[PDB]
Symmetry: C3
Subunit: 114 residues, 3 copies
């Protein structure tokens, strides 16, 4: 799995250890080894949400499997709470897009996962 | 919905008010409330389009519904027009990827929209 | 086609000519003219792969067709070889997501490809 967070919160406000934290939380939540987990955090972005520039975030979670109705509900509870706790972003100014990737459309190590 | 513009135009060329303007235009074209519209502009990027580094942009528009054959042409006409008029990017150096998102794959405020 | 590379490799380590090389190699592998290829490279990112901050990359290739299990394996071999030679990123620290786009979902030049 790969998790991207794009946010207008400044780089100084991202807690040292945030990426390692997310890695760990995503391993437990998706039941996937931390070895295949990639996390990418992009602060200081020029963005608006509802027309304003208060703290917001636009996130994507791509995974091979483990995506769907119930699971995405669980992920949204977990991830909005982590962004609210550590970045101080209201949960109503977060969007998370979930992508179920086919294993043939994920390249890794010079091949794909199918 | 969410609209992301990645461009090699410098930050000082983005006009004051541009994200607010995009927010209102997208509210009117999609017919969704402005409250659920997020806009993200990424200037100063390192990019080429057709093998050259003239001004260009790579954009994405993600919405739950209101995405389709005819609608995507109207969005393209509106958005390439605004990019050309505001950022001075020619319409033939703009790509816009359109995504119809299922409500169960969009997380917001700790739940999904399903 | 459009190819995006996000990486934690510093900007100074991306060699002059890399975007043109990527254009040329994409055009040959996919058979699309260089005119419709856009390349976007984003260095200096805050990202972890497998929980560590060694050199890594998260890439996406979007194309209207020419995406498939066997084609994707060939793209992966070429692209990871290019990343490895030019940016010194190990191939097991690269993910590449592949997207086959419908023509109606790609805007270009004030309209769509449909």
């Amino acid at each position: 799995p790969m998790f991207i967070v794009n946010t207008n919160v400044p780089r100084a406000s991202v807690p040292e250890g945030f990426l390692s934290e997310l890695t760990q939380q995503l391993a437990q939540a998706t039941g996937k080894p931390a070895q295949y987990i990639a996390v990418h955090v992009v602060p200081d972005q020029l963005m608006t949400f509802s027309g304003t520039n208060d703290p917001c975030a636009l996130c994507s979670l791509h995974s091979i499997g483990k995506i769907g109705g119930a699971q995405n509900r669980n992920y949204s509870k977990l991830l909005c709470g982590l962004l609210s706790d550590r970045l101080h972003i209201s949960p109503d100014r977060v969007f998370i897009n979930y992508y179920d990737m086919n294993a043939a459309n994920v390249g890794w190590n010079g091949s794909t996962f199918a």
